[PDB]
Design a protein around this nucleic acid. Sequence first.
DNA 1: GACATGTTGCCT
DNA 2: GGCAAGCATGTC
Length: 206
Amino acid sequence: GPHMTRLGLEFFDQPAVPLARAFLGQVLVRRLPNGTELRGRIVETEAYLGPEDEAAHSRGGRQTPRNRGMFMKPGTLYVYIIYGMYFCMNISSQGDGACVLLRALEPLEGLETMRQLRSTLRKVLKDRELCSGPSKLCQALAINKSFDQRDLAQDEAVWLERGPLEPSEPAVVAAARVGVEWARKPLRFYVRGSPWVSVVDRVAEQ
DNA sequence: GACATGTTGCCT
DNA sequence: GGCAAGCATGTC
Ligand SMILES: [Mn+2]
């Protein structure tokens, strides 16, 4: 096989917007306790800018017991429970209270384990339903709160390997964020034409 | 203590 | 497309 490295501090240490864009095409890897490796290529992200960003948990520089990952070194995971039953996986970027939400993956390896984790553990699921959402991907990759405040550059259960297929400048759609002035600002980024994206913005494309 | 707020699967 | 169940969390 190929000599496989992992993306380190050099990659994670950049402003939220650049990082959110740079994530596109990269491959998120999860190794389960049973030895099974799961792989998914990132196709959709969101940038949360910090104290000025009225949609971010760090708005006005607010630091709570929950959002501490956002104020820790670039690469630190911020995993929180939303709607009492779902997880959102964020990665701290460079900049006070700034992070990036992972929204969607193209599933590449371990799809049958993903389908079990998505259906057998809670509530035939098509391949498109596996990772097409921030909380869907957390379920499919077995991400929960025990992953909160871990370092994505150093952790032996979850890492980021560099992807062979990365989009260039014109292939990236900058659109409004999902479920959030700061509601309308284009801080969501996804691969144009990808069937694995959670929500298509047909207005921000045309 | 109260209570407002924050994605997915089904349904309209 | 619309619609809330879900309960963790933050705030008063
Ligand atoms: Mn509700």
